[PDB]
Every structure is written in structure tokens, then in C-alpha cells.
Amino acid sequence: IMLEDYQKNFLELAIECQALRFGSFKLKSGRESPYFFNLGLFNTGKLLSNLATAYAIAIIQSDLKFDVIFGPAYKGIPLAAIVCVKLAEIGGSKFQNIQYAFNRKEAKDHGEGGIIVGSALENKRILIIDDVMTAGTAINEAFEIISNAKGQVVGSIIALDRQEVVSTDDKEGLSATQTVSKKYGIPVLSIVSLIHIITYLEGRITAEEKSKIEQYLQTYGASA
Amino acid sequence: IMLEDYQKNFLELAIECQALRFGSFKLKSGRESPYFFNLGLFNTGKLLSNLATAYAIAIIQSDLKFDVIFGPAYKGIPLAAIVCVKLAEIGGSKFQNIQYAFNRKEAKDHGEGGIIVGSALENKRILIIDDVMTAGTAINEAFEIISNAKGQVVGSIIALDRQEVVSTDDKEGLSATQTVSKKYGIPVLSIVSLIHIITYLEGRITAEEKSKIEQYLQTYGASA
Ligand SMILES: O=P(O)(O)OC[C@H]1O[C@H](OP(=O)(O)OP(=O)(O)O)[C@H](O)[C@@H]1O
Ligand SMILES: O=P(O)(O)OC[C@H]1O[C@H](OP(=O)(O)OP(=O)(O)O)[C@H](O)[C@@H]1O
Ligand SMILES: O=C(O)c1cc(=O)[nH]c(=O)[nH]1
Ligand SMILES: O=C(O)c1cc(=O)[nH]c(=O)[nH]1
Ligand SMILES: [Mg+2]
Ligand SMILES: [Mg+2]
Fold this sequence. Notes:
The structure is a homodimer of 224-residue chains. With 224 residues, the first copy, chain A, is α/β, with parallel strands linked by helices.
């Protein structure tokens, strides 16, 4: 339960800008969650740079080799851009050829056409970047988009691993990130997990929100 | 005729990544154009960083004061993010507080909800960032989004002013940028104009491409 420097830095900022919030939220999966992590609150020049640094440190740590960083609409779009920039800035010589890409929700019926903006994906190694993983639906849809574009996914990175199951009916009790990793045979990286949030906020948190967090995790929390 | 250094550098950048395409393109306005400037081709970390620098210099030298840099979907999304970062990096204390924002095409039906990602627009001074202006429809629609959110548009910046009319029926034949600027009483900044890129390319434009561009501008080119 010991946090790394860049994780402590990231979580400190997440609290400051109110990216991490407690209440009542309908997730994309339709789950009623007592907390929500909104990366859209990292919205100053400094916070965006700090956010990009957090991802870049996690990516550098993994020693993963890739050509394009792909961010799915919508949260993934600014993420792909800022992290691509950051990796070329702090990568030294390893990420000097690094490219970015993202998708439109719908194919463009004029201009250059297509759904992919940025780098062409065919025959390139792709890192998928996103904000959070819950049930893993978004990443699976991103995988298909990339597969259809003839790119090869070599990994994924998220800011927050919510440590939830794909479905409550899954027998092994593997988290979404673990399921995706095993399913595609690729590393799934994260800056922090829910466990890091709980252990970091330990020094200054109720004790009433914890009740709702534990109640939510009995339903959706991974056990493996 | 006489280019500023940041313009020279940008034009070099545009040629480096070959952002200017030739062929037969249907524009968003439905115009059939012999050329197409695709900002999606600034697709490496270095290209994105240098692209952001071009926007940032132009913004800084305009002395415009604003709170949020807003980029319309889709091309404006990475632009708002990278230029927000860049301005905080090179702009000094006058730009340590600016925030970025962008829109989804459709309202989010869950989570944080809404159409705006990043900074809330209400009660803030907004600079709209986009890639190109042709007929000006995108910037008008961005203005409407911001105005309906009770934000205050204070200016706009694009990479390329295509120097075309809003409508062939407009009486003075002012360009789209000139029309938008007068209409809203706001500056409309552009890194470069069509005439800059054509002049810069010199003999690199073919006889076929030259003739097609002439024909296009006889129809759609501004005169004021
Ligand atoms: O693991 P999952 O269950 O798929 O949920 C996680 C996804 O949900 C959100 O996207 P969403 O489309 O809701 O929001 P956005 O429009 O802000 O990207 C989030 O950005 C993740 O991509
Ligand atoms: O001045 P106008 O006549 O409005 O044309 C310029 C706009 O057209 C393109 O957007 P589009 O929605 O076609 O493409 P995108 O989805 O790649 O942003 C371009 O990115 C500008 O925003
Ligand atoms: O599952 C989601 O929809 C979701 C959860 C979360 O914590 N943050 C987010 O942006 N989306
Ligand atoms: O008008 C357009 O659709 C358009 C023109 C252009 O040169 N580049 C672009 O991205 N869109
Ligand atoms: Mg998303
Ligand atoms: Mg656009």
C-alpha cells in the first residue's frame, strides 16, 4: 500500500482541481456509483501538463515499444495529444518518432473522410490511452476500431483503474483491466487504482462515504 | 509579401508534414476544392508541439485577454489542449490561469453530463481555436454554443485563412474571417493565409494545380 512519487503527485492534484468527486453518478455502464473521476477537471495549462507527465512516467516505466498513441472519443482525444507531446519532450530519443491518433464518433462524409484523425493506423503498434476503465466496453470498442484500421494494439493505459468486474456474472472475478489484458495478451497500465485512492485519502476521509464505496464494491468490485 | 518568423516556421512545418493536399475535395460547405489543408497531419509529438508554438506566438502578440481556449469538435479538440499547455509554458504569468474546453457533438447522457468538456463556459472570456476557415460556419456555430452557455467570445484564431467568401452573394466580397470579425466585433487571428502558402511553395505547385486554384478563387475568393 505504498504509493510512488508520481502517483502521490497525481492524486494530490486530482483532489485540488476536484477531479475526484463523491456523490451519486450514473456511469456509462449504467452502474450507480458513489464516486466519479472526471479528467475534464485537469483543465489549466499546468494541470494538463501535470496530467501528461503522470501518463508519460507510467508509459516510460513499462518500457513498452509503440508507434502511435490512440485516444478514443471523447476524453481520449486531448489525452492522446498531450501525452504524445509530453513523450517527445521527455523521452529523450526513444519517443522522437511518436505519433498520435483519435476517432470521430461518426465517419466524416466530406473532406479527408474517415473516422481516424492523426496518424494512419495500418501496420503500426498502437497504445490505447483513456481516462478510466470500468466494465471495459470503451477499450473493447477502441480495439475493434484499431483492428478495422489494420493497426496492432500492443498495450493500453488509463489514469484510473476502478478495479471493477466486466460483469457480475464473470466467474474468476477478474477486473476489467485484468480481463482485457488476458483477452488480448497486452499490458494494461494505470497511473492509479481505486485502492491507491482509498489508501491515500485514508489520512483525511469519512467514514460515511466509505460505507457507500464498500457497498458499491460488494456488488461490482473485483476479487482476483 | 513579408512573413513574420513564426509564420515562416509554420509554413516549413506544413511542408514537413505535407498538410496541404491536392486533388478533388468536397468541403464542409459543399464547395468542390482543388486543395485541402489537413491539420490532422501534424501528427507527431514534435509536429504538435511546434504547431502549438505557432498558435501561441500569434495569440501572445495579439495581446488578447481571455480565460478559456475553446476548440470545436473535432479538429479543435487537440488544438485547444496543446495550445493551452503551450501558452502556460511560454506566455508567462498572464497565461498561468487559462483553461481549455471543447464540445461533444451530442450531449453526454450520463456521468458528468452535458456537451462541454474542460472548463465551464459561463461568465468567462472565450477564445475560439480552429484549424481553417472557409465559409465561417464552424466559427458561427462555436459562437452559438458559447453564447447559449452564457460565455463571452472575445476572439478567434485559426491556422489557415483560406481567404474565401461566406457566400458568393455577399455584397462587398469580404472574406469569411473579415465578415466574422466585423459581425461580432472580435479579432479573428490567422497564423497564415492562402496567399502565404501559395507564394511559399513557389514552383512546387504543378501547372494543373495552379489552373485549378485560379478557377476556384475566381468563384470563391475574397476581393476586400
Ligand atoms: O470501461 P467502461 O465501462 O467502458 O467505461 C469507461 C469509459 O466511460 C467514459 O466514456 P464516455 O463515452 O462515457 O464519456 P466521454 O464522452 O467523456 O468520453 C470514460 O471516458 C471511459 O472511456
Ligand atoms: O469555415 P467552414 O466552412 O465552417 O469550414 C471550416 C471547418 O470545416 C472543417 O470541420 P469539419 O467538421 O468538416 O471536420 P472535423 O470533423 O475534422 O473537425 C474544419 O475543421 C473547420 O472547422
Ligand atoms: O464508468 C464511467 O462512466 C466513468 C467512471 C469514472 O470514474 N469516470 C468517468 O469519466 N467515467
Ligand atoms: O472547408 C473545409 O471543409 C476544409 C478546408 C480545408 O482546407 N481544410 C479542412 O480541414 N477543411
Ligand atoms: Mg470516453
Ligand atoms: Mg472542424
